């Protein structure tokens, strides 16, 4: 019977809410990383055709899904 | 009686400690983002008066509370 | 008897899996921060000998363990 109890559901929903907080926080971080990168690449600071620069685009792309 | 039991409190405190780890980790990340940004803006790399650059300051400000 | 029950172990393993997700996510973020920084420092954008620039290397080093 524990999975219908109040206490099990309290803890479960706290886990779920933390997992959501982590997902939304990671999305916020990686959206920031994307917004910064594209500005930095607008300069001669970072060149889009350098393979090390493409590595960053590819990570950001993959993180934003 | 479960909320006074040892097991419920063990799990609850693990949740709490994870939530703290997430908060402190996000604060570390966003403090880093702030420290990097202000250095990058010291250059002509990023211009503080560009509206896309202000977007980044505003996100960092909001994240650091 | 609760620590051998199914429900306690279900919640515990969810905590553990979330903690792993957080660790792996933070490592991904800080690896990205390292990869970006070293590219930015390749330019006159950021000078490795400036003490504020060394602060960033030191944080990244410490985060990657």
Author numbering:
A (entry chain A), B (entry chain A), C (entry chain A): 6 to 70
Provide excerpts from the study.
Influenza virus hemagglutinin (HA) is the major surface antigen of the virion and the primary target of virus neutralizing antibodies (Abs). One of the most conservative HA stem regions is a 55 amino acid (aa) long alpha helix (LAH) which is currently under intensive investigation as a potential universal influenza virus antigen.
The stem peptide encoding HA amino acids 403–474 was the longest fragment (Mw = 8.5 kDa) which was efficiently produced in a soluble form and was selected for downstream applications as HA tri-stalk protein. The crystal structure of HA tri-stalk protein was solved to 1.7 Å resolution using molecular replacement technique. The space group was P63 and the HA tri-stalk protein was found to be located on the crystallographic 3-fold axis. Therefore, the crystallographic asymmetric unit contained one protein molecule. The structure revealed that HA tri-stalk is an elongated trimer with the length of approximately 63 Å. Each monomer consists of a long α-helix at the N-terminus, shorter antiparallel α-helix at the C-terminus, and a small flexible loop region on the surface of the protein connecting both helices. The central long α-helices form a tripartite coiled coil with the short α-helices packing along them and forming a 6-helix bundle-like structure. The protein clearly matched the structure of the corresponding stem fragment of the native HA at its low pH-induced post-fusion conformation.
